[PDB]
Scaffold this active site. Structure first.
Site, PDB file in Angstrom:
ATOM      1  N   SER A 189      -4.615   5.736   1.705  1.00 51.23           N
ATOM      2  CA  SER A 189      -4.688   4.557   2.248  1.00 51.23           C
ATOM      3  C   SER A 189      -5.970   3.997   1.577  1.00 51.23           C
ATOM      4  O   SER A 189      -6.835   4.405   1.154  1.00 51.23           O
ATOM      5  CB  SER A 189      -4.710   4.348   3.739  1.00 51.23           C
ATOM      6  OG  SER A 189      -4.799   2.989   3.886  1.00 51.23           O
ATOM      7  N   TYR A 248      -7.866   7.560  11.594  1.00 49.42           N
ATOM      8  CA  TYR A 248      -7.010   7.728  10.599  1.00 49.42           C
ATOM      9  C   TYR A 248      -7.453   7.809   9.237  1.00 49.42           C
ATOM     10  O   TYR A 248      -6.915   8.283   8.302  1.00 49.42           O
ATOM     11  CB  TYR A 248      -6.183   6.370  10.864  1.00 49.42           C
ATOM     12  CG  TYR A 248      -5.238   6.085   9.646  1.00 49.42           C
ATOM     13  CD1 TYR A 248      -5.352   5.097   8.615  1.00 49.42           C
ATOM     14  CD2 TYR A 248      -3.995   6.997   9.481  1.00 49.42           C
ATOM     15  CE1 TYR A 248      -4.616   4.770   7.546  1.00 49.42           C
ATOM     16  CE2 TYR A 248      -3.212   6.623   8.290  1.00 49.42           C
ATOM     17  CZ  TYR A 248      -3.466   5.669   7.372  1.00 49.42           C
ATOM     18  OH  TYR A 248      -2.670   5.353   6.347  1.00 49.42           O
ATOM     19  N   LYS A 297      -7.158  11.043   6.125  1.00 48.33           N
ATOM     20  CA  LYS A 297      -6.837  10.574   4.824  1.00 48.33           C
ATOM     21  C   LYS A 297      -7.965  11.032   3.762  1.00 48.33           C
ATOM     22  O   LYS A 297      -7.772  11.579   2.720  1.00 48.33           O
ATOM     23  CB  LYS A 297      -6.443   8.842   4.453  1.00 48.33           C
ATOM     24  CG  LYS A 297      -5.218   8.610   5.245  1.00 48.33           C
ATOM     25  CD  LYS A 297      -4.041   9.113   4.560  1.00 48.33           C
ATOM     26  CE  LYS A 297      -2.844   8.825   5.364  1.00 48.33           C
ATOM     27  NZ  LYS A 297      -1.569   9.362   4.889  1.00 48.33           N
TER      28      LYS A 297
HETATM   29  N1  LIG Z   1       2.216   1.134   6.153  1.00 46.13           N
HETATM   30  C1  LIG Z   1       1.125   0.971   5.593  1.00 46.13           C
HETATM   31  O1  LIG Z   1       0.359  -0.250   5.708  1.00 46.13           O
HETATM   32  C2  LIG Z   1       0.359   2.081   4.922  1.00 46.13           C
HETATM   33  C3  LIG Z   1      -0.893   1.841   3.905  1.00 46.13           C
HETATM   34  C4  LIG Z   1      -1.473   2.827   3.454  1.00 46.13           C
HETATM   35  C5  LIG Z   1      -0.890   4.117   3.386  1.00 46.13           C
HETATM   36  N2  LIG Z   1       0.191   4.173   4.132  1.00 46.13           N
HETATM   37  C6  LIG Z   1       0.588   5.747   4.280  1.00 46.13           C
HETATM   38  O2  LIG Z   1       1.922   5.901   3.500  1.00 46.13           O
HETATM   39  C7  LIG Z   1       2.489   6.976   4.240  1.00 46.13           C
HETATM   40  C8  LIG Z   1       3.867   6.327   4.766  1.00 46.13           C
HETATM   41  O3  LIG Z   1       3.560   5.332   5.528  1.00 46.13           O
HETATM   42  P1  LIG Z   1       4.904   4.327   6.004  1.00 46.13           P
HETATM   43  O4  LIG Z   1       4.496   2.767   6.027  1.00 46.13           O
HETATM   44  O5  LIG Z   1       6.237   4.827   5.080  1.00 46.13           O
HETATM   45  O6  LIG Z   1       5.205   4.809   7.397  1.00 46.13           O
HETATM   46  P2  LIG Z   1       6.270   5.458   8.159  1.00 46.13           P
HETATM   47  O7  LIG Z   1       6.240   5.660   9.474  1.00 46.13           O
HETATM   48  O8  LIG Z   1       7.739   4.779   7.718  1.00 46.13           O
HETATM   49  O9  LIG Z   1       6.638   6.936   7.233  1.00 46.13           O
HETATM   50  C9  LIG Z   1       5.952   8.135   7.611  1.00 46.13           C
HETATM   51  C10 LIG Z   1       7.062   9.397   7.938  1.00 46.13           C
HETATM   52  O10 LIG Z   1       6.595  10.444   8.392  1.00 46.13           O
HETATM   53  C11 LIG Z   1       7.188  11.058   9.140  1.00 46.13           C
HETATM   54  N3  LIG Z   1       6.655  11.949  10.034  1.00 46.13           N
HETATM   55  C12 LIG Z   1       5.486  11.554  10.830  1.00 46.13           C
HETATM   56  N4  LIG Z   1       5.143  12.885  11.550  1.00 46.13           N
HETATM   57  C13 LIG Z   1       6.084  13.948  10.986  1.00 46.13           C
HETATM   58  C14 LIG Z   1       5.678  15.367  11.147  1.00 46.13           C
HETATM   59  N5  LIG Z   1       5.239  15.893  11.954  1.00 46.13           N
HETATM   60  N6  LIG Z   1       6.925  16.110  10.458  1.00 46.13           N
HETATM   61  C15 LIG Z   1       7.883  15.422   9.445  1.00 46.13           C
HETATM   62  N7  LIG Z   1       7.591  13.992   9.356  1.00 46.13           N
HETATM   63  C16 LIG Z   1       6.941  13.425  10.125  1.00 46.13           C
HETATM   64  C17 LIG Z   1       7.952  10.000  10.040  1.00 46.13           C
HETATM   65  O11 LIG Z   1       9.055  10.384  10.639  1.00 46.13           O
HETATM   66  C18 LIG Z   1       8.205   9.002   8.620  1.00 46.13           C
HETATM   67  O12 LIG Z   1       9.568   8.965   8.170  1.00 46.13           O
HETATM   68  C19 LIG Z   1       1.609   7.467   5.247  1.00 46.13           C
HETATM   69  O13 LIG Z   1       1.173   8.564   4.918  1.00 46.13           O
HETATM   70  C20 LIG Z   1       0.584   6.468   5.670  1.00 46.13           C
HETATM   71  O14 LIG Z   1      -0.767   6.567   6.087  1.00 46.13           O
HETATM   72  C21 LIG Z   1       0.635   3.416   4.766  1.00 46.13           C
HETATM   73  O1  LIG Z   2      -0.887  -9.888  14.943  1.00 46.52           O
HETATM   74  C1  LIG Z   2      -1.804  -9.863  14.082  1.00 46.52           C
HETATM   75  C2  LIG Z   2      -1.851  -8.884  12.891  1.00 46.52           C
HETATM   76  C3  LIG Z   2      -2.627  -8.837  11.984  1.00 46.52           C
HETATM   77  N1  LIG Z   2      -3.556  -9.833  11.789  1.00 46.52           N
HETATM   78  C4  LIG Z   2      -4.421  -9.901  10.517  1.00 46.52           C
HETATM   79  O2  LIG Z   2      -3.765  -9.465   9.517  1.00 46.52           O
HETATM   80  C5  LIG Z   2      -4.281  -8.650   8.498  1.00 46.52           C
HETATM   81  C6  LIG Z   2      -3.410  -7.558   8.065  1.00 46.52           C
HETATM   82  O3  LIG Z   2      -3.184  -6.996   9.460  1.00 46.52           O
HETATM   83  P1  LIG Z   2      -2.358  -5.362   9.325  1.00 46.52           P
HETATM   84  O4  LIG Z   2      -1.006  -5.655   8.823  1.00 46.52           O
HETATM   85  O5  LIG Z   2      -2.298  -4.879  10.598  1.00 46.52           O
HETATM   86  O6  LIG Z   2      -2.972  -4.576   8.123  1.00 46.52           O
HETATM   87  P2  LIG Z   2      -4.455  -3.939   8.246  1.00 46.52           P
HETATM   88  O7  LIG Z   2      -5.213  -4.053   9.317  1.00 46.52           O
HETATM   89  O8  LIG Z   2      -5.234  -4.564   7.078  1.00 46.52           O
HETATM   90  O9  LIG Z   2      -4.152  -2.242   8.140  1.00 46.52           O
HETATM   91  C7  LIG Z   2      -2.659  -1.861   7.896  1.00 46.52           C
HETATM   92  O10 LIG Z   2      -2.829  -1.350   6.498  1.00 46.52           O
HETATM   93  C8  LIG Z   2      -3.557  -0.318   5.882  1.00 46.52           C
HETATM   94  C9  LIG Z   2      -3.661  -0.354   4.527  1.00 46.52           C
HETATM   95  O11 LIG Z   2      -4.816   0.980   4.432  1.00 46.52           O
HETATM   96  C10 LIG Z   2      -2.893   0.719   6.864  1.00 46.52           C
HETATM   97  O12 LIG Z   2      -3.346   2.255   6.318  1.00 46.52           O
HETATM   98  C11 LIG Z   2      -2.635   0.693   8.177  1.00 46.52           C
HETATM   99  O13 LIG Z   2      -2.152   1.731   8.825  1.00 46.52           O
HETATM  100  C12 LIG Z   2      -2.221  -0.698   8.848  1.00 46.52           C
HETATM  101  O14 LIG Z   2      -2.495  -0.787  10.128  1.00 46.52           O
HETATM  102  C13 LIG Z   2      -5.775  -8.130   9.157  1.00 46.52           C
HETATM  103  O15 LIG Z   2      -6.680  -9.005   8.570  1.00 46.52           O
HETATM  104  C14 LIG Z   2      -5.631  -8.545  10.756  1.00 46.52           C
HETATM  105  O16 LIG Z   2      -6.770  -8.866  11.302  1.00 46.52           O
HETATM  106  C15 LIG Z   2      -3.706 -11.001  12.578  1.00 46.52           C
HETATM  107  O17 LIG Z   2      -4.395 -11.892  12.595  1.00 46.52           O
HETATM  108  N2  LIG Z   2      -2.780 -10.839  13.568  1.00 46.52           N
END
Ligand SMILES: NC(=O)c1ccc[n+]([C@@H]2O[C@H](COP(=O)([O-])OP(=O)(O)OC[C@H]3O[C@@H](n4cnc5c(N)ncnc54)[C@H](O)[C@@H]3O)[C@@H](O)[C@H]2O)c1
Ligand SMILES: O=c1ccn([C@@H]2O[C@H](COP(=O)(O)OP(=O)(O)O[C@H]3O[C@H](CO)[C@@H](O)[C@H](O)[C@H]3O)[C@@H](O)[C@H]2O)c(=O)[nH]1
Ligand SMILES: NC(=O)c1ccc[n+]([C@@H]2O[C@H](COP(=O)([O-])OP(=O)(O)OC[C@H]3O[C@@H](n4cnc5c(N)ncnc54)[C@H](O)[C@@H]3O)[C@@H](O)[C@H]2O)c1
Ligand SMILES: O=c1ccn([C@@H]2O[C@H](COP(=O)(O)OP(=O)(O)O[C@H]3O[C@H](CO)[C@@H](O)[C@H](O)[C@H]3O)[C@@H](O)[C@H]2O)c(=O)[nH]1
Lengths: 364, 364
Positions: free
Chosen positions: B127, B155, B159
């Site tokens: 991330s 978190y 990572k």
């Molecule tokens: N969503 C975001 O804003 C964001 C941003 C940066 C990085 N990421 C990273 O990308 C990856 C995927 O994120 P996503 O948005 O697709 O979330 P997501 O929850 O849809 O995908 C995560 C998957 O992991 C699985 N999982 C969790 N624990 C498990 C376990 N113990 N065994 C097997 N499967 C398990 C869940 O069932 C799910 O399918 C994650 O590593 C997350 O940290 C996401």
């Molecule tokens: O109800 C809400 C939700 C969010 N925000 C704002 O919107 C922006 C984005 O919010 P959000 O989608 O929650 O993203 P981030 O806080 O930037 O973090 C997300 O994106 C990361 C990217 O690294 C992931 O790792 C995290 O799991 C995920 O929580 C931020 O500035 C927040 O303050 C609001 O103002 N109101």
């Protein structure tokens, strides 16, 4: 009793002298070790010195169920000192997975079992390798605790990863209690991140010291092998460093002062309850390799032979400590000296050339 | 086939679109997930779009034996894409142990099983939270890959810990082969550290999107709930930031471009074999919260109601990406735009207000 303490490792080098200091302080000690790099005989040597003995539990630190059995049998522990890890820097570059599995995951199993059984205090055995090279930063030598961390080897990364884990886990326990309006429960959770530097020496009685498995790799144990006949000579790693003689600089602290630092830290946790805080456990005295060879040769009598070899990969210039924080906050100071460490180290090696797999001479 | 790939997560958000792009590229995909935060229905939607289907294995990532069964049944995998983790930032401050157990230890189990069965390529889902706040550094915005890492939440630390593990483990495999004079075996081991930023949108067909368990917390999914009737309004976190309107800045990238970046990275590993290298997966376009509310409102038709709330703890000012490295080395660029993401996101929500636990309307 003046409290109960679980000591992982415990039978190891720093672990043995720590459990020794704990029992002499009046603590109840339960030692946990799989005996990977130590012997259970060290406990028998403790009984001969202190008169008290610690309970021993033989288990792998990666076995979470084993940690549960201990806490269930000893519900009065409340605090744990964590020594159990792999410490070979060079080996960590060969098989880092084993280091991440034992050091990092082993700590995870501990914390999970700790939260599960409500033991709230932990003292972690961190290293000074988390600082990496401190010459990339102006005015960072001697090295303070507020130095930005950046290890150069997998072993350092494990220690660095654990420190982050200890902080997050414990702070969560405190913050969750604050949210629930329970300031009492929050204050109970504390953590001491003791960053060791370079340990040396043994017990002045000469019945207890360092007896590991495999082949030694540290400076002093190798010097001890030269002075005893096992080694032919010592291989000095680099003579072109930015010191006065040309050899690298380290902070050598006696094992007795190192182990006593845990008692100070454990008290500071039960007193102020500051949560999580790091402390350097050094002397502040920088010593070159040449000075150490000379210091230990003087402790033996004759001058040990050595030969100059090129630099060892990953070796930093200086690793001097800035223990000012530990002196003021913990009230801990390195009593014993560097030369004083060589004397009781040679005492241990001369009388016990084969460690714990032999019986010591007629002592008292 | 154009290669085989194991995809942990796979049924998740970013995982589903990634496995979709893999199958369309001609890859053989085996999906691993315990279905903690996703549904297995996503695979059925993939079959409807691509015509091809991936093999599904239901297992916990913390189950090392389960990883062995997969590789033994599929000895031709050779490469793994790692999505399986917990991603809730706020929740990580409540129960970090579960994050260290799933993210960190789960990765350890994978690598151990990978080395055991000789699969040498891994693409990790990192991330942008590893950078922490980048305003403490002069000229660090937009954020380049060479920015010193320093997360502010458990978190992020998970990572960050994994990245260090991936580097150490893979480099060891290469260095051990070099020492044994086997440059061929050394080149096979590679790792791609893809640091995602802020994903958004869904599939343009409107049959596939994000359908998690529990309550949403991200900006766009919450906006989707407002526009659909589930939410009353949106709570903007802080309006006193150093932006032009007062709201925080993020880098919103379409999920299709985000998933396609894995194909570019996977090719770069099978080609140059650079070992371990990190890449930012953003657009370089910084967008405020107000701009996002307006962008998504335009995609829906009406302007969504919102109310200003104080700042959310741990929220940084700017998280704009510097994707210049990904554009030149990987040959990857964000094709789709920000507004283009709101359109197919609203398409997904409007037609499928209840995610995968319902059947989509008459589509083709
Ligand atoms: N969503 C975001 O804003 C964001 C941003 C940066 C990085 N990421 C990273 O990308 C990856 C995927 O994120 P996503 O948005 O697709 O979330 P997501 O929850 O849809 O995908 C995560 C998957 O992991 C699985 N999982 C969790 N624990 C498990 C376990 N113990 N065994 C097997 N499967 C398990 C869940 O069932 C799910 O399918 C994650 O590593 C997350 O940290 C996401
Ligand atoms: O109800 C809400 C939700 C969010 N925000 C704002 O919107 C922006 C984005 O919010 P959000 O989608 O929650 O993203 P981030 O806080 O930037 O973090 C997300 O994106 C990361 C990217 O690294 C992931 O790792 C995290 O799991 C995920 O929580 C931020 O500035 C927040 O303050 C609001 O103002 N109101
Ligand atoms: N020796 C040093 O120069 C140095 C410097 C800085 C920090 N430290 C750290 O201090 C701690 C103790 O170091 P030491 O010099 O006492 O080394 P040591 O080898 O004597 O002590 C480590 C103990 O851990 C045990 N152990 C290893 N894996 C285990 C497992 N899976 N389950 C149960 N027990 C296990 C060993 O049996 C041994 O008793 C380590 O964490 C080390 O990284 C040491
Ligand atoms: O045969 C030898 C051995 C060592 N040295 C030098 O002596 C110094 C100290 O060597 P050593 O005892 O191996 O200590 P360090 O390399 O400083 O690291 C040790 O001390 C760390 C303290 O953080 C622990 O974490 C490590 O596990 C342990 O390997 C260094 O400058 C070496 O280059 C030699 O010249 N010749």
């Amino acid at each position: 009793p003046s409290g109960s303490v679980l000591v992982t490792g415990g039978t190891g080098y720093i672990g043995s002298f720590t459990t020794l200091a704990l029992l002499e302080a009046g603590y109840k000690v339960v030692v946990a070790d799989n005996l990977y790099n130590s012997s259970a005989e060290a406990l028998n040597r403790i009984e001969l010195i202190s008169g008290k003995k610690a309970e021993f539990a033989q288990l792998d630190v990666t076995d979470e169920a084993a940690f549960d059995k201990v806490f269930e049998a000893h519900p009065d522990i409340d605090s744990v000192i964590h020594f159990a890890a792999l410490k070979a820097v060079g080996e960590s570059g060969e098989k880092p997975l084993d280091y991440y599995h034992v050091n990092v995951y082993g700590t995870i199993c501990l914390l999970r079992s700790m939260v599960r059984h409500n033991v709230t205090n932990i003292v972690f055995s961190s290293s000074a390798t988390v600082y990496g090279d401190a010459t990339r930063f102006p005015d960072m030598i001697p090295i303070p605790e507020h130095c930005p961390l950046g290890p150069t080897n997998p072993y350092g990364n494990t220690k660095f990863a654990i420190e982050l884990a200890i902080t997050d886990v414990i702070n969560a326990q405190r913050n969750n209690a604050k949210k629930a309006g329970n300031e009492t429960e929050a204050a109970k959770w504390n953590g001491a991140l003791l960053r060791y530097f370079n340990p040396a020496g043994a017990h002045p009685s000469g019945i207890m010291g360092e007896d590991p498995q495999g082949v030694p790799y540290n400076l002093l144990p190798l010097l001890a092998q030269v002075a005893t006949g096992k080694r032919e000579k010592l291989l000095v790693f680099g003579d072109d460093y930015a010191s006065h003689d040309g050899t690298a600089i380290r902070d050598y602290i006696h094992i007795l002062d190192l182990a006593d630092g845990h008692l100070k830290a454990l008290n500071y946790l039960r007193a102020n309850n500051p949560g999580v805080r790091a402390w350097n456990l050094g002397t502040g005295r920088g010593s070159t390799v040449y000075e150490m060879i000379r210091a230990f040769s003087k402790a033996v009598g004759r001058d040990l032979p050595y030969e100059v070899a090129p630099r060892r990969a990953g070796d930093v210039l200086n690793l001097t400590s800035n223990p000012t924080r530990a002196n003021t906050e913990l009230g801990w100071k390195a009593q014993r000296t560097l030369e004083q460490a060589c004397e009781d180290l040679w005492l241990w090696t001369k009388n016990n050339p084969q460690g714990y797999r032999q019986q010591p001479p007629a002592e008292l």
